[PDB]
RNA sequence: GGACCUGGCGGUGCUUCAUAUCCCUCUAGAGGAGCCUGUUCUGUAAUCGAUCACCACCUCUUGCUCAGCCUAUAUACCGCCAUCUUAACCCUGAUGAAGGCUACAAAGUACGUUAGGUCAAGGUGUAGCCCAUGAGGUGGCAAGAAAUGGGCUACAUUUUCUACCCCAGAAAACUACGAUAGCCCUUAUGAAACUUAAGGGUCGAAGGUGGAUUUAGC
């Protein structure tokens, strides 16, 4: 009427601040590259950067938190962790299909491993 | 369109096409880089000498910032049509569709968002320093500029009485000082804040407390004066009319200071939709006089910017605005050149001089390889956005517009 | 007449050096209407001549030279009003002459024209004297002035002149 | 009109002091050369602007390909940044405004916004010119002086050169010191070196310690 009469969830990552990555929070991806004497560090990072991209576009409003990326030999990991809103069939159809192509992209091994999670795990609201 | 491609040409009068260069066709407009007077600079430092350290710097960013986004004060008006939006969609939603005192309060604290805090600025001596060196060699170029057009398109003009609302610094006195200092023979001076009054006289008598102004005829008041009788020839307010609570306080300061206006009256605001909203509602006030039978019955005009007096054509959406490039003063945090963005009107009594009036430039001038880009506002009220070629317009239009500039005048006739 | 505003009383602290409402050991008289009234009991002062006393910041000053006076002769005593004084004259060309001086020493009997003297038996000789002055002085001042009435000369040189 | 209550005094002055930054003191430098910057003024038909751009002249024409254009627009969106906004209880006064402490203790405890910049096309659009905003050619255009604003070498004896890594020998203010000043030549990298860098030679300029102010410090 006048003037005078006038006058957020956060999950573990989302609450700790950049400073805090070794010392609270982890790496979400884990390889060798970044070691001294390894090569190869920004092949990886745009391997990464794709498979954040397509993960996140392939399971659109599933993904609860962050994937973890992992890297043993030339084995490729991706750790999700996904909700329980999605049918179990689609999941199963889109975990196929997602394994597949990104194997044939990387021409490597990969695979996936969906936990699901009843709903987001709030830590803190900022 | 005041730009048909091969009808158009160049208005030569006083020969100035066979007798001048085009660098100086007379639409140039452009001020040099302003400098401060070596007294101003100096007496802002030496006021400043007590305390300048970083806690400064970040001040004055933030309060510069602060002034350059504020709103509007948001009248009633507004708001109600906000609530009663907010609270029909809410009515809609069955969640939010809770009881009326429920609802009231959730569309109050939605309202707190989308809607600008807008909160009276109280300057204690603190915060006048602080905007003091803020503002004030930015508001003293903006000045410059302002009366500089009036000196270059009128230079038989010899004022002898100026007027300033919300006079914080004194930069309009010292602009007026620096330009027609020669006959100026008073300066009103009003501003409400007592800290500001004490600021500026001490910066007149060079940064004490005690000395000889250096700008003789100099008063100092804080309640405006209200009497048609007392007429001026200049009267100016710069950043002024934005501190106001609210529009009923702008219109009437606006119609006291037209009254009191002998020859003409400069308004001076950030170069922002604010205060562009702001200048266009005083000159639609201005312009649209209601005063049944006022003691001066000379009517008013435009004298700058705009060639017209119909509507601004760029008030649906966008703003007209203007840039001078200035020296800032010498502090740990003032290196190169700035630019100072500011909107402008100048309303001046009696009628346009004559009818061969010429578009205003609104927007920088872009030059490519044998074309040139200016946004015009013509005298019939639209605006143009012209590509000036040799081939089409003339190789005198085309130089005539390669070396003009932001805020200039495009001479064309017909 | 565009004349120059009225000094406010803040004005006239500055002026004196005193920076204080307590130490100005006199009483200002800053109404233009008041002043008014009093030139206006004054008399008529069309083409007339006039020798105004203590203006101080000028209310009375302005007052009378609203009023279509002939001339306004200023007496000051204090040099610190005499800047406000010349702006009012460089308002109001040739219609104000300001004096550095007494008022209770000033010859008035040479300050006007000799062409205004008229015979004493005549009506008023068209100058007035018009006065607002601290009590402390206007009494030796008033008489003064009797006395050159009963005399004759003075500011009487010129005739039964009109005082306020 | 009488009595009383809360106040605010954007309050005004004085005695004490903590009184740190800023002063003063101490030291360290710098301030006067020769490099750059940004501005102004003057002058040009034109820009001391990055082949392209500019000025004065000309030419081409359905042409390149239903051509072509480093044109405008984020003041079209999207995005990347940046701006601003976002208490209760219990006693006292006769149950009046109102008030509530003493320790050898006397009622007190608990998202929106933007004439924002960034296409020196992150992407999707929208308009411009299309006998000239397209494509060529011929000439010219490669400015001058102060200033004030600030990143830049030495001025020599507690110095320089050699041996050495601290017990030596020389040279010393006109064959003294010093240039990251100018010129020439070699090397490095590159298709390309006046372009950039390094080395040698030539040279041996100012400099003769620079006040007010003033820059730093625990
Ligand atoms: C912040 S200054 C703007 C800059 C100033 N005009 C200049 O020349 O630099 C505006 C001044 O106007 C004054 N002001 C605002 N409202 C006023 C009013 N209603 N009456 C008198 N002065 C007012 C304030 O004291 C404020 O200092
Ligand atoms: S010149 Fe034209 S566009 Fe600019 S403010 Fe005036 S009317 Fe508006
Ligand atoms: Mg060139």
Same mark, same amino acid.
């Given at each position: ?5 006038? #006058? ?11 400073? !805090? ?5 982890? #790496? ?27 993960? #996140? ?48 992209? !990387? ?17 803190? !609201?900022? | ?11 030569? %009068? ?5 007798? $001048? ?8 407009? %452009? ?51 906000? *609530? $009663?939006?907010? @609270? %029909? ?7 939010? +569709?809770?009881?009326? @005192? ?38 003293? *170029?903006?000045?410059? $500029? ?61 940064? +004490? @407390? ?15 004066? &209200? +009497?048609? %009788?007392?007429?001026?020839?200049? &009267? ?7 501190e106001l609570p609210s529009k009923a306080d702008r219109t009437e300061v606006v119609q006291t200071l037209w009254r009191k206006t002998g020859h003409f009256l400069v308004l001076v605001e950030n170069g922002t939709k604010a205060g562009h909203s702001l200048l266009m509602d005083a000159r639609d006030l201005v312009l649209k006089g209601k005063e049944k039978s006022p003691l001066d019955p000379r009517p008013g005009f435009v004298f700058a910017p705009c060639p017209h007096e119909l509507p601004c054509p760029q008030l649906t959406n966008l703003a007209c605005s203007f840039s001078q490039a200035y020296h800032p003063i010498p502090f740990s945090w003032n ?15 009696? +009628? ?7 578009? $205003? ?10 074309? &040139? ?42 | ?6 000094? /406010? ?25 008041? /002043? ?24 009375? /000053? ?98 039964? /002149?009109?005082?306020?």
């Open positions: 009427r006048e003037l005078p009469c006038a #006058w957020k969830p956060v999950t573990y990552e989302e609450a700790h601040a950049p400073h !805090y990555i070794a010392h609270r929070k982890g #790496w979400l991806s884990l390889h060798t590259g970044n070691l001294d004497g390894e090569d190869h560090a920004a092949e990886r990072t745009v391997e990464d950067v794709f498979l954040r991209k397509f993960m #996140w576009g392939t399971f659109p409003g599933c993904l609860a938190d962050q994937l973890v990326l992992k890297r043993r030999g030339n084995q490729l990991e991706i750790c999700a962790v996904v909700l329980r809103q999605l049918s179990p069939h689609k999941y199963y159809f889109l975990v196929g299909y997602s394994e597949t192509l990104l194997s044939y992209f !990387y021409k490597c091994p990969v695979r996936l491993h969906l936990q699901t999670v009843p709903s987001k795990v709030v830590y803190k !609201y900022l | 369109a005041a730009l048909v491609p091969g009808v158009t040409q160049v208005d030569n %009068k006083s020969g100035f096409l066979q007798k $001048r260069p085009h660098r100086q066709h007379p639409g140039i407009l %452009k001020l040099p880089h302003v400098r401060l007077p070596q007294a101003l600079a100096n007496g802002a430092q030496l006021l400043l000498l007590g305390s300048a350290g970083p806690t400064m710097e970040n001040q004055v960013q933030t309060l510069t910032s602060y002034l350059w986004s504020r709103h509007l004060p948001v009248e009633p008006e507004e708001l109600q049509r906000r *609530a $009663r939006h907010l @609270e %029909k969609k809410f009515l809609e939603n069955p969640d939010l +569709s809770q009881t009326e @005192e429920k609802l009231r309060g959730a569309v109050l604290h939605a309202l707190r968002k989308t809607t600008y805090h807008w909160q009276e600025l109280s300057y204690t001596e603190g915060l006048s320093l602080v905007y003091m060196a803020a503002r004030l060699d930015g508001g003293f *170029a903006a000045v410059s $500029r302002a009366f500089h057009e009036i000196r270059a398109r009128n230079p038989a003009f010899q004022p002898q009485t100026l007027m300033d609302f919300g006079s914080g610094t004194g930069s309009v006195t010292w602009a007026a000082h620096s330009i027609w200092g020669q006959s100026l023979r008073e300066y009103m001076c009003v501003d409400r804040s007592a800290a500001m009054l004490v600021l500026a006289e001490k910066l007149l008598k060079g940064g +004490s @407390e005690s000395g000889e102004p250096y700008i003789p005829g100099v008063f100092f008041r804080q309640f405006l004066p &209200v +009497s048609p %009788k007392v007429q001026f020839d200049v &009267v100016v307010s710069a950043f002024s009319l934005s290196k190169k050149p700035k630019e100072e963005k500011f909107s402008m009107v100048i309303l001046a009594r009696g +009628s346009p001089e004559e009818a061969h009036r010429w578009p $205003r430039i609104t927007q920088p001038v872009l030059k490519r390889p044998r074309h &040139v880009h200016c946004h015009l506002c013509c005298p019939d009220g639209h605006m143009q956005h012209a590509v000036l070629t040799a081939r089409r317009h003339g190789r005198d239009l085309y130089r005539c517009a390669r070396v003009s500039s932001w805020g200039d005048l495009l001479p064309v006739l017909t | 007449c565009r004349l120059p505003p009225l000094p /406010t009383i803040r004005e006239i602290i500055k002026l004196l050096r005193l920076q204080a409402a307590k130490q100005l050991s006199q009483n200002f008289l800053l109404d233009l209407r008041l /002043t008014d009234k009093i030139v206006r009991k004054a008399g008529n002062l069309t083409n007339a001549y006039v020798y105004e006393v203590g203006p101080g910041p000028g209310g009375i /000053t302005r007052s009378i030279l609203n009023a279509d006076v002939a001339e306004l002769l200023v007496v000051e005593k204090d040099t610190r009003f005499i800047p406000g004084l010349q702006m009012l004259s460089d308002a109001a060309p040739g219609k104000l002459r300001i004096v550095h001086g007494d008022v209770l020493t000033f010859k008035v009997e040479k300050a006007f024209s000799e062409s205004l003297k008229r015979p004493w038996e005549d009506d008023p000789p068209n100058v007035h004297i018009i006065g607002n002055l601290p009590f402390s002085v206007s009494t030796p001042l008033i008489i003064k002035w009797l006395e050159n009435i009963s005399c004759r000369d003075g500011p009487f040189v010129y005739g039964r /002149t009109q005082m306020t």
